[PDB]
Each structure stands twice: as C-alpha cells, then as structure tokens.
Design a protein around this nucleic acid. Structure first.
Lengths: 95, 131, 88, 275, 71
RNA sequence: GGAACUUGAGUGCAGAAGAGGAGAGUGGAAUUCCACGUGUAGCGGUGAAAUGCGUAGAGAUGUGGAGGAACACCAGUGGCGAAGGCGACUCUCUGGUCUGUAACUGACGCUGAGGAGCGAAAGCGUGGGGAGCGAACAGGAUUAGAUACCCUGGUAGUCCACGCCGUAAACGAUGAGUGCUAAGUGUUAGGGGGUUUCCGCCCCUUAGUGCUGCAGCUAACGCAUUAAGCACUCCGCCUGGGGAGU
RNA sequence: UGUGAACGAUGAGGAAGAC
C-alpha cells in the first residue's frame, strides 16, 4: 500500500444535481477500490490557458488517499467511461 | 587486486624514492619486516618502526638520503613474480651491479644477502634485487 | 518487491545466530528470493535483456557463494540446498 | 500459436494449423445445435449460380444470438468451442437465467468472466452496449446496421472497428479497411475486436485440405474455350489481347466499379476507398 | 569570484516544495514567454531545477500553466 | 591440511539521486491531407532559371476534422547504463550505482580461451502502419558530357509487433582488476565538522566527470590520482608493403 | 581591471576538366 494524490476535472456547465451524481459515483468507485480517504480539497472553477475539448474553463477537484497498488488500474478506465469527466491524473505522493 | 604485498611494498619504496618524502607506511607481515631489516642492515634506509593497530599494520619506513643529494638507490627490481616461478642454486646466484649490489634471497635458514648466502652455501628463492 | 516483512520473516528462519544478519545462509536465501522474483519478472516480459543479464550476474553470485559453501561445510550445504530444493 | 509441420511428405512442406488453444471442450451443447444442408452453391432452380462450391466436410450450426436482445442480466463464460462455419471462434456463455447462447468471441476473454448485455454494462471486453454510451475511439465488434437485426458487421476473426466520434444522429464508425459510415446511435454494438487474428497466417499447404473447406479448384480463364470464356481461344496461353480484362460475364473486373451510382446507403458514405 | 546575482531565493525559504499543488509559485517560475527560467537567473542547483522541471511538466498536465504563449 | 583475524569482498541497517529496462495509458505544438468560410493572380523554388502547383479559385487567412511520426524550449564537457546506447508526462513491474555511522559472514577475490547473452544504422522474413523525410526512379536545370552536387516529385526504407542478420571511425583508435605517485581550478550526488534557529559562509572526506599543470614516460605530438607515470594479475592482439581481409 | 586557451553546440555569399 502507498499514498496517492489524484486530480480530475468535471464539466463547468454541468447541473449541480448531476455533479452530485458524478461525485457520489466517483466516491462509490473510490471506496469500491479500497482507497481509504486521507484528505481532500475543492479547487473548483478555474479559467484555462487552453481548451481541452472546447471548454474555456473547468472544475478542478482533487483527492488524497491511502491505497493500492492495484486500484488505480481499475479506477483509470472507469474514469474514462464518463463523458462528463474531462481529464484525470494519479500522481504518487512523495513530496 | 592486491596480488602480492611484497612487490607492492617495492613499488612503495621506489615511488617513495621518486617523491622524496621522508617516510611512508606499509601493511605488516613478518616476511616484509625481515627483508626490511635486511635493508636496515645494508643501510640504504635510515630506520624502520612498526606501529600496532588491529589487526595487521602499520610499519613506517624512513628513507635515508645522501649528504650530497643523489638517490641512495639507483635501481630496485623484483625478478620473482607470480605466474613465473624462479629458482637459484647456491653457486648460480649472480652478483648484481658487481660488488656494490646485494641480492635478497629467501632461504631455508631465512632471508639472506648474497654474501651471507655464499658463506652459508644455502640456495633459495630470489625475492628481489636492490642497487 | 520483496516487501520488508517478508524479508524479516525470511532472515530469522535461516539465521544460525540470534543476530546472524550476514552468513552465506541468509545471503543465499535473500538472493534466492531476488532470483525468484526477478525470474518471474523475466517470465512476464521476454524483452527484459537488462534484467536477464542482471539475473546472470546474480546467478554468478549464487554460484560463487554456494561454491565456497561447498568448499567449507558440505553438511550445512546439503542441508541448505535440501531446505531450498535448488542446485541440480 | 502456429504449429509448423516437418516436411515428412510434399504436403507437409508448407501446411500449418492454428494452436486451437482457445478451445476447451471437445463437443457442443446439444440444445443449440442446428442442421446445415450444403446447397453446393446451386440455385433453387438447380443451376449453379456460384462457381466452385460444395464438396466440403459436413457441418452443424450452433445457434448464436448476435442481437443480444436481453439486457440487465449478467452472464458467464463457461466454455469456448471451434466453429467450422467461420474463422471466428465461438465461446459459450451461461446467463444467470440459466439460458445458454453461443456468442462471438473477442480475444483475451477468460473463462468465468461476468458479462452484462445491458446499457449499464462496463466497457470490459465481451460486453455489448449501445453506441451512445460508447466512449470515442474504443474498438468495437459485431456492430448491427439496425437494432434487432443482428450484427452483420465485423463477424470474421481478427477484424476491428473504431469510433471517430458521435452526434445524436448518427454515431461515426471506422469500418475495416478504413471506410466510414454514420451508423444509428440507438443501434447496439459490442466492444473489443474479434480474436483468432492468427487465422490469416495459416497455410493450407496442399490441395487436399482445400477439399475439406471445401474450396473447389478454379480453371484459369485463358485455358478455357473461347465459347465459355472471353479470354479463351488462341494457340497456347493466349495473350489478353482483347480489350479490357473481363469476367466470363460481360462486366470487366480489374478496377471497374460494380457499385450502383444511386443507392440508399450513398448518403451514409462519409468516406470511401482509402486503399 | 564568485557569486551569482538573483541566486536561489528558494532554499532560503524552502524546501521540499511543491511538488505541484501550488499555483502561485509556479506562476513565479513561468516567464512571459511561458517557459521555465534558466538557472542563470533562477539560481537553482541542477537537481532542484530538474525536479522543478518534471514538477512544472506535472503542472502542465494539470493545465495550471500555459504550455505556450506570446513572447 | 588444521586452528584464527578484518582491512579485500559480500550481506544488512539508515539514506541519495539517475533520458536505466520492459509494459499500458495520456499530452500539446507543428508538418500534411480533407471539409467549409474569406478573398484573387500568382504561389513555389534557384547562383540565375525552369520543371511543379493554381481561375476546375490556388497560395494566403479563419474554423473544424483526420492520421502518423517526433518530444522543442527545460538541456547543463549534466545523469544513468556493461557496451550499444537511453531526452514529453503518468502509472505498473524491475535491474544497477553511490554515501554513512557499522551489525554479520571471514578471503567467500581477480581475470578469463571455449561457450552463452546483449549488441548503432542499414538489410532480410511475416502481419500492420505510413504525416513528413527519402535511396531507386521520373522530370527540370548545371556541364563538352552530369547515370551527380541544385530544384520539383517520389517507391522501398524510415514507424509498430513477432524473428533473423551480429556488421560500424562499435573511438578515448588507450582491455579488465588493484596498489602507489605534486597539485590546482569547476561541476554530479552524498557524509562530517567550525559560528549562525535558519539563511548562508568556511574547512574536511567519498565516488562520477571537465580543464590546466609537478614528477615521471615518449620517435615526436602529448599523456599526466579519469597515465599513455611507477608496479602487479590475467585475457585479446601485432612481426615489411602490394597481392589480401581476396 | 579585466589576455590569450580551451571545450560542448552554428548559419551562409554563387556555375566550370586535366598535363
């Protein structure tokens, strides 16, 4: 087991309820993977120097979890299936 | 890789002659201290003194130097070497550099100078020549 | 990796002494575990030529250490290779 | 894998066969077996519309619901079996209902893996979910042209397809050899390219194995009598002197388009002939 | 002989940063041209500058900073 | 051969960084093509030109889409790796190196014919890919001739996957290991200390690596604690040129 | 105050034989 920090972007235009749906979904997946919570923060809306698909800005969101080591391998594709999410990255925590 | 401590001590004393430092250190062995005592008898070197530290070592050798500059020894070489055994019958031993030079020949009676070896009529391995 | 707990378990089982951190026993044991993991790693990918040559070096190490162990105490050696099931 | 044969005989010199490693059980389930009378390529009138067909080994069809009309019900891959009818291997799958249906088998599938046919199903290989839910660029197989019709597209082994993107109507798809069509968004499809890619590499190595296929030999056209073939006649290996290489039927074959210039599918052809 | 102008100013108030979570200091590292400043100005040791390099690349992965802009 | 020792060596503990290897995913810029908008006689190329592209509306510009290849700037006689060689990012597995009190093993070391593995680029076999670049080749120029240097194109190749081939100025034209031998001035990562909480200055000690130079070596050029210096151990190799690496 | 040397990496000024 090891620590992990993860960032991901959700769509700026999304309704707050649907945002609650995708966040409870990402949390249910994150706990399905056995990734224990350590801490989290909400960067929220921020302007972008460049668009990814088209959007001029995005909702940043981050999590910090103690976990495998096996889970990220399943978490990535499940982070790929959703059209609502834009980007996701999982960096190891070794400050 | 430390193939032979004695030849190493010989390149130590030769390099020491080249650098003209007053003294240098060598790892201990009775084989080394005996021939060093032989050089002490020959007088080419001023003094040798061991200093104990666990386990082996460390001898400190003081090079002698002439009153009018000049290296005390004009040459030094170890004819004996691993991968090429050498032997010498008691009458067969050369008198290197004629009368000035002396052989260092280990024998059954112990390490001996070519004069003492000729007197004892004892042959043995020729460790090195110094001149 | 191997994980640190597995090392602590692997060492204590084979020590001849209460604090025998060294010894050809424990050395060949830890190197054996490294050989097994690296061998399975070679099985995962045949393209790992560097892991392969490194494995060859570690085989040189095990061969030299077991050779000297044959040179010293044949009884401890046969008991050890019987314990591990290795060596021909 | 491919097992090369030692040249013990002249037919051994080139013949090769696939490893059959995917196969698990020697025999098909009795419940889904179906008869296959060999037409031999003849018309119902009895005339041979298609040249050099029939004479092959006997075959027995296994029922396969490409449509996958049921949904929301998890399945399981019990076994995999050889299919004489096509290059693609068949993999039997046991539904939670206790229903059993042979299904097309993408490579890399493992025995006992769960498979849901529903829209909510995961991208993981062997699943079949509607194109609207499919992420762009993922490989897809057994694509239907219309819902409920079955997946005529990409049934043969080793073939693949990719999504260039999608609108509400219609989803884009890269058909094999680079052609593209706006397939209906509502239409169902199955992620993951079909296995047995090594089938193309297989070498027959003798005339005798072809008889079992059974691919009947085709006479070269120049050899044929002039009354029978346009390229016939001449005093031994006649040059294709006559203008425009030709089929025994009057339409030219080399580089001549056989497409109808007016067709319902022409609107759907965003791209054609990449070569 | 010898001293560099505008050297470091990081170890003096470091260290272990960031690795990339901050945006203000990375906004300090970026030039008007949008590229990382040379060690001749930044003053950092090459190891710190390279860990900073991979860190800012991670920031570009976070899209917290422009990849390219006007000069 | 018996009995011992830790300094050679190995292992451990505590740390240190590295384009190291392989697998998977992902990134943005640009070239090119396609689609449309805009707008019109040039565009492109050379020493000069012409071939070529363009009123069937190019080039240019705006937007969108597609595909492949490479990773700018960071980047540094920087780093890693045995060599060859490795330069976007993330993750997965994993090799190697260095430092430090110091635990343990107690010579368990070095080299190494045969043998085995790796081994640039080009090439060959099979299946894919092919944006650009580009042998062969086509055309236009240059010239007495131009089977070239130049330009406009362009196949194989260059790319991937599974194999073969095992050649390079594969060079540092300097084999590997170890000991010793003035120094100096940087850097690459560590360790200790002498004031200072720190910052930071100073001194010392390891290993990597750049240059300048004392002794010493030299046909000369030069080398020079990274010897080609003084020594040791082992392997590879040389015996006039051409004929002939035939 | 500041002289040469040295390294790693360039930007471009054009067509023509032999004894």
């Amino acid at each position: 087991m090891r620590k992990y920090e993860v960032m991901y972007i959700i769509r700026p235009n999304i309704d707050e309820e649907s945002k609650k749906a995708v966040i409870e979904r990402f949390n249910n997946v994150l706990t399905s993977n056995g990734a224990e919570i350590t801490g989290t923060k909400d960067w929220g809306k921020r302007r972008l120097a460049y668009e990814i698909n088209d959007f001029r800005d995005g909702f940043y969101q981050i999590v910090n979890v103690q976990s495998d080591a096996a889970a990220v391998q399943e978490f990535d594709r499940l982070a790929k299936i959703s059209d609502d999410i834009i980007r996701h990255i999982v960096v190891k925590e070794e400050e | 890789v430390m193939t032979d401590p004695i030849a190493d001590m010989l390149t130590r004393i030769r390099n020491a002659n080249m650098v003209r430092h007053e003294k240098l250190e060598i790892p201990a062995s009775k084989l080394k201290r005996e021939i060093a005592e032989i050089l002490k008898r020959e007088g080419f070197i001023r003094d040798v003194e061991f200093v104990e530290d666990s386990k082996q070592g460390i001898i400190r050798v003081f090079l002698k130097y002439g009153q009018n500059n000049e290296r005390v020894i004009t040459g030094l070489k170890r004819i004996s070497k691993p991968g090429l055994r050498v032997y010498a019958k008691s009458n067969e031993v050369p008198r290197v550099l004629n009368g000035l030079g002396i052989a260092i020949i280990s024998t059954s009676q112990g390490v001996l100078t070519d004069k003492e070896a000729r007197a004892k009529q004892a042959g043995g391995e020729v460790l090195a020549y110094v001149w | 990796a191997i994980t640190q707990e597995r090392k602590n378990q692997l060492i204590n089982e084979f020590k001849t002494h209460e604090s025998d951190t060294g010894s050809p026993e424990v050395q060949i044991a830890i190197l054996t575990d490294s050989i097994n993991n690296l061998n399975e790693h070679l099985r995962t990918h045949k393209k790992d030529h560097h892991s392969r040559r490194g494995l060859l070096k570690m085989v040189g190490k095990r061969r030299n250490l077991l050779t000297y162990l044959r040179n010293k105490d044949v009884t401890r050696y046969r008991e050890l290779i019987n314990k591990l099931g290795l060596r021909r | 894998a491919i097992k090369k044969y030692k040249p013990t005989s002249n037919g051994r010199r080139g013949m090769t066969t696939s490893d059959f490693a995917e196969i698990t059980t020697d025999k098909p389930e009795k419940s889904l077996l179906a008869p296959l009378h060999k037409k031999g390529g003849r018309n119902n009138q009895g005339k041979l519309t298609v040249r050099h067909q029939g004479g092959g080994h006997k075959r027995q069809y296994r029922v396969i619901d490409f449509k996958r009309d049921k949904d929301g019900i998890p399945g399981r891959v019990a076994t995999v079996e050889y299919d004489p009818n096509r290059s693609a291997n068949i993999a039997l799958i046991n539904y939670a209902d206790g229903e059993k249906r042979y299904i097309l088998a993408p490579k890399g599938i493992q025995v006992g893996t769960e498979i849901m046919s529903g829209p909510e199903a995961d991208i993981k290989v062997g699943n079949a979910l509607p194109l609207i839910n499919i992420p762009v660029g993922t490989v897809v197989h057994n694509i239907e042209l219309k819902p409920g019709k079955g997946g005529q597209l990409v049934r043969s082994a080793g073939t693949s397809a990719q999504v260039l993107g999608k609108e509400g109507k219609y989803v884009l798809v890269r058909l094999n050899s680079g052609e593209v069509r706006m397939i209906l968004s509502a239409c169902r499809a199955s992620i993951g390219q079909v296995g047995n890619e090594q089938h193309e590499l297989i070498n027959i190595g003798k005339a005798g194995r072809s008889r079992w296929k059974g691919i009947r030999p085709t006479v070269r056209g120049s050899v044929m009598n002039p009354n029978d073939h346009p390229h016939g006649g001449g005093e031994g290996r006649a040059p294709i002197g006559r203008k425009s290489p030709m089929s025994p039927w009057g339409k030219p074959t080399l580089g001549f388009k056989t497409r109808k210039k007016k067709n319902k599918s022409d609107k759907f052809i965003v791209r054609r002939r990449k070569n | 002989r010898a001293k560099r102008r505008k050297v470091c100013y990081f170890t003096s108030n470091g260290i272990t940063h960031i690795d990339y979570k901050d945006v203000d200091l990375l906004k300090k590292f970026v030039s008007e041209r949008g590229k990382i400043l040379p060690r001749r100005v930044t003053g950092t040791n090459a190891k710190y500058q390279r860990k900073l390099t991979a860190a800012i690349k991670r920031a570009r992965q976070m899209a917290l900073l422009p990849y390219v802009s006007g000069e």
